[PDB]
Symmetry: C2
Subunit: 120 residues, 2 copies
């Protein structure tokens, strides 16, 4: 029986354009993690679109980190490949992105959708 698709983000949210004033990148397992390392003292929420089976996340489509004024400051996306990310890969990447954004005293939370299925 088929998995479920959960969206925090509208399609405009997924393709909103951004750029990092101070860029940082990384590749981990099979995910790409990005963060503006210029952003300071902001209030940030991570929003995601992903499928679930069970009550755990199965495949990430896209996670973005939004400041309260709507700037995109961070991002996790899957890559084409072998292997392909698990739920663990994504959990760790969230911790890695959150840790990174806290460096410059950003306050970071996740949506309820992420909290229930992915990171916590």
């Amino acid at each position: 029986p088929a998995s479920r698709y959960l969206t925090d983000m509208t399609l405009e949210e997924m393709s909103r354009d951004w750029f990092m004033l101070m860029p940082k990148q990384k590749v981990a397992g099979s995910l790409c993690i990005k963060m503006d390392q210029a952003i300071m003292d902001k209030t940030i929420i991570l929003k995601a679109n992903f499928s679930v089976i069970f009550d755990r996340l199965e495949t990430l489509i896209l996670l973005r980190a939004f400041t309260e004024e709507g700037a995109i400051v961070g991002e996790i996306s899957p890559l084409p490949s072998l292997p392909g990310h698990t739920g663990e890969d994504v959990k760790n990447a969230i911790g890695v992105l959150i840790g990174g954004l806290e460096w410059n005293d950003n306050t970071v939370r996740v949506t309820e959708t992420i909290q229930r299925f992915a990171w916590r």
Copy 2:
């Protein structure tokens, strides 16, 4: 039971100057955290000099991050902003530094001294 001073670093290692190829720093209360962003895929050890009373760090003199080739790639030092810095503050700073060094797939370990008194995990 007065404090005693624990020393992971030689006087040389303590007083050496250094520079970051890609500088990253932050102030967390009354500590200064620095790390070279250009260090990638290396093994790294954290060494510290600090005092201890009984079972925990009392005051940090200096903590530094070393490659096997002896470069300094990370540092945590106290600032004069007085009161001051607690063991907790230090604990948190080691945490944040490790996460920082781990971004670029460095493998970071700590001396037994740090592990016992200052930060574990």
